[PDB]
Amino acid sequence: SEGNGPAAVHYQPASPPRDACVYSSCYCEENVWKLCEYIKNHDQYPLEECYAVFISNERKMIPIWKQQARPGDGPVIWDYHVVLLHVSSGGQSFIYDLDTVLPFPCLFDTYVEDAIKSDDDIHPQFRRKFRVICADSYLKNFASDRSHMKDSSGNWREPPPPYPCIETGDSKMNLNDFISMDPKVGWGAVYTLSEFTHRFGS
């Protein structure tokens, strides 16, 4: 046996339960934005402890396991996926991924072990990078007009959310600047899988 302390075990979630959260399939960027807004609007946790995390790569083909779109027989290959990360004071980070079949929220190390998995034997073009944006900056800066979800014929790929598009004074659309894993573009910091797990893993 092996045993560590001190530790974090009565963690109260920063969000409502999964089934009470704002959610539209295939609008993870917005689902995460709405989690960030909830946290900002409540007095449980400081917003400074929370991050939006975009997962993608140059080829926009990233596997994630433990996904509701294909349970039991992962991975799902996404163009990008977005989750919320909360760094709690208890010694410990948590992932809030409304699309996971893991718990909501899930301990960071579990999510990385079971949903992300190692890149070591993954074909290099499918390896994962992580853009980590402070929640306050994500709320300040993110904008999407949803135009990436409307095909050539003007049909929606998946139904858009019913509330108005997220826009800022500076932009009506900058989604690509968050999907990008070019560290010279956009906001926040871009990490390799190893760097990401080094920063947040226990």
Author numbering: 1 to 202
What does the paper behind this entry write?
The human C8orf32 gene encodes human N-terminal glutamine amidohydrolase isoform 1 (hNtaq1). Ntaq is an initial component of the N-end rule pathway and converts N-terminal glutamine to glutamate. In the N-end rule pathway, N-terminal glutamine and asparagine are tertiary destabilizing residues and these residues are converted into secondary destabilizing N-terminal glutamate and aspartate by deamidation. The N-terminal amidohydrolases are classified into the N-terminal glutamine amidohydrolase (Ntaq) and the N-terminal asparagine amidohydrolase (Ntan), which share low amino acid sequence identity and mediate the deamidation of N-terminal glutamine and asparagine, respectively.
In order to understand the relationship between the structure and function of hNtaq1, we determined the crystal structure of recombinant hNtaq1 bound with the adjacent N-terminus of a symmetry-related hNtaq1 molecule at 1.5 Å resolution. The hNtaq1 protein contains 205 amino acids, of which 202 have been successfully modeled in the presented hNtaq1 structure. Three C-terminal residues (Lys203, Asn204, and Cys205) were disordered in the crystal and could not be modeled. free values of the final refined model were 14.4% and 17.0%, respectively. hNtaq1 is a monomeric globular protein with a novel structural fold of alpha-beta-alpha three-layer sandwich architecture. The catalytic triad (Cys28, His81, and Asp97) is highly conserved among Ntaq proteins, transglutaminases, and cysteine proteases of diverse organisms. In the structure of hNtaq1, Asp97 forms hydrogen bonds with His81, Tyr111 and a water molecule 1 (water403 in PDB) and His81 interacts with another water molecule 2 (water444 in PDB) via hydrogen bond. The N-terminus of a symmetry-related monomer is anchored into the active site of hNtaq1 with the side chain of the N-terminal residue (Ser1) in close proximity of the catalytic Cys28. The surface charge of the binding cleft is predominantly negative, and several hydrophobic and aromatic residues (Val76, Ile77, Tryp78, and Tyr80) are well oriented to recognize main chain backbone of the substrate-mimicking peptide and to stabilize aliphatic part of the bound substrate-mimicking peptide. Overall, the active site bound with the substrate-mimicking peptide directly suggests possible interaction mode of hNtaq1 with substrates.
